[PDB]
Design an enzyme around this catalytic site. Structure first.
Site, PDB file in Angstrom:
ATOM      1  N   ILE A 294     -14.848 -58.079  18.406  1.00 42.35           N
ATOM      2  CA  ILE A 294     -15.370 -58.616  17.300  1.00 42.35           C
ATOM      3  C   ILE A 294     -14.424 -59.196  16.260  1.00 42.35           C
ATOM      4  O   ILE A 294     -13.325 -58.743  16.271  1.00 42.35           O
ATOM      5  CB  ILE A 294     -16.206 -57.512  16.462  1.00 42.35           C
ATOM      6  N   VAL A 295     -14.788 -60.327  15.857  1.00 44.07           N
ATOM      7  CA  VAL A 295     -13.963 -61.084  14.934  1.00 44.07           C
ATOM      8  C   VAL A 295     -14.623 -61.241  13.352  1.00 44.07           C
ATOM      9  O   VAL A 295     -15.664 -61.442  13.477  1.00 44.07           O
ATOM     10  CB  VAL A 295     -13.718 -62.323  15.486  1.00 44.07           C
TER      11      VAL A 295
ATOM     12  N   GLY B 236     -18.220 -63.946  14.774  1.00 47.08           N
ATOM     13  CA  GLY B 236     -18.761 -63.778  16.079  1.00 47.08           C
ATOM     14  C   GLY B 236     -17.842 -62.724  16.823  1.00 47.08           C
ATOM     15  O   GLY B 236     -17.284 -61.750  16.437  1.00 47.08           O
TER      16      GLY B 236
ATOM     17  N   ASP C 128      -7.589 -71.512  32.019  1.00 44.65           N
ATOM     18  CA  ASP C 128      -8.822 -70.729  31.507  1.00 44.65           C
ATOM     19  C   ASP C 128      -9.335 -71.120  30.503  1.00 44.65           C
ATOM     20  O   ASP C 128      -9.814 -70.716  29.589  1.00 44.65           O
ATOM     21  CB  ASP C 128      -8.825 -69.220  31.461  1.00 44.65           C
TER      22      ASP C 128
END
EC number: 2.7.11.24
Length: 353
Positions: free
Chosen positions: A33-34, A27, A145
């Site tokens: 970016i992961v 993802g 959040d």
């Protein structure tokens, strides 16, 4: 010899320590970016998040700094923790990127939202958001959040909270719109907040898990408020007494609604309710929903009372609920101001030590 190797993932160059092999992009959300990776040293799969020039602006820098400090000092099984941190670059001037190594989870809640959970799983997931949240609160951190993308899950139904939310303090050149759907009225109307601001967010997620759609899907704070008051109705007079005359004027002058009832907003057709067990669980599911989804936070259920709720209490564990509070060394963490060069040095000192 260098300790690092470089490989492409989409349009990004990952430059990682050699112990991490076989990168899969899992993802690309908000922070960067992961990748999933195999870690040859620990003999397990991990997640690797690349922060690109975190110090580029004050929002990315405050969020990236805050993330690093907290991920180090909080030790709770319902909050992602850092296995490793690195930078490929050798010195402060060359310094570009930070890599966060975390335990790998299977998915986030957006994917769970499209499933039909039994009561036992749903109650458990929710109980774990509560323990994660309580822990943060026991250390002075109010999230403000929570959303389905910041909450990741395992196949055995274990859950962790990904990030530590907003601070106590700003513009950004981004193509990425921010999600406001889970924001509490006191944040939307700007009237100040306490612990149970997070429970509005939990109630929004829980409502989405049930209905399989976003409860309050507004494009801006105005469209958001409209959708809140259609569903739940116009808040009562004594709530309005807490709004500044500028915003109060706006709120007071909106078309009124008596609003829908919780059985109408959340029919029994949405819950497992074939057995008696399921029937009883379903009415306890609505009961709790009707206490989290209160607009006036003077009249919204608190974290601990939600942990005490019958639908939740099934899983209660003091070891998990009253784990010792995390010690935070920074202490000016929530409200510190710096220039981008000063952030670079703070972040670097953090990645290095």
């Amino acid at each position: 010899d260098n300790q690092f190797y470089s490989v492409e993932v989409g349009d990004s160059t990952f430059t990682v320590l050699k112990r991490y092999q076989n990168l899969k992009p899992i993802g690309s959300g908000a922070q960067g970016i992961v990748c999933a990776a195999y870690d040859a040293v620990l003999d397990r799969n991990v997640a690797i998040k690349k922060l690109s020039r975190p110090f580029q602006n004050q929002t990315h820098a405050k969020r990236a700094y805050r993330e690093l400090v907290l991920m180090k000092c909080v030790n709770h099984k319902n909050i992602i923790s850092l296995l490793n941190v690195f930078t490929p670059q050798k010195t402060l001037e060359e310094f570009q990127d930070v890599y966060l190594v975390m335990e790998l989870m299977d998915a986030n809640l957006c994917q769970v939202i499209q499933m039909e959970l039994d009561h036992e799983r749903m109650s458990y997931l929710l109980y774990q958001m509560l323990c994660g949240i309580k822990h943060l609160h026991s250390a002075g951190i109010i999230h403000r959040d929570l959303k389905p993308s910041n909450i990741v899950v395992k196949s055995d139904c274990t859950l962790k909270i990904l990030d530590f939310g907003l601070a106590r303090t700003s513009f950004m050149m981004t193509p990425y719109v921010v999600t406001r759907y889970y924001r509490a009225p006191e944040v939307i109307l700007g009237m100040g907040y306490k612990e149970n601001v997070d429970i509005w967010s939990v109630g929004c997620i829980m409502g989405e898990m049930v209905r399989h759609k976003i409860l309050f899907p507004g494009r801006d704070y105005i469209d958001q408020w409209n959708k809140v008051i259609e569903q739940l109705g116009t808040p009562c007079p004594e709530f309005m007494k807490k709004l500044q005359p500028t915003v109060r004027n706006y709120v007071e002058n909106r078309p009124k609604y008596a609003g829908l009832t919780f059985p109408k907003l959340f029919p029994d057709s949405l819950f497992p309710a074939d057995s008696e067990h399921n029937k009883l669980k379903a009415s306890q599911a609505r009961d709790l929903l009707s206490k989290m989804l209160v607009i006036d936070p003077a009249k919204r259920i608190s974290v601990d009372d939600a942990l005490q709720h019958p639908y939740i209490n099934v899983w209660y564990d003091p070891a998990e609920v009253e784990a010792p509070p995390p010690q935070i060394y920074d202490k000016q963490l929530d409200e510190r101001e710096h220039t981008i060069e000063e952030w670079k040095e703070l972040i670097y000192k953090e990645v290095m030590n």
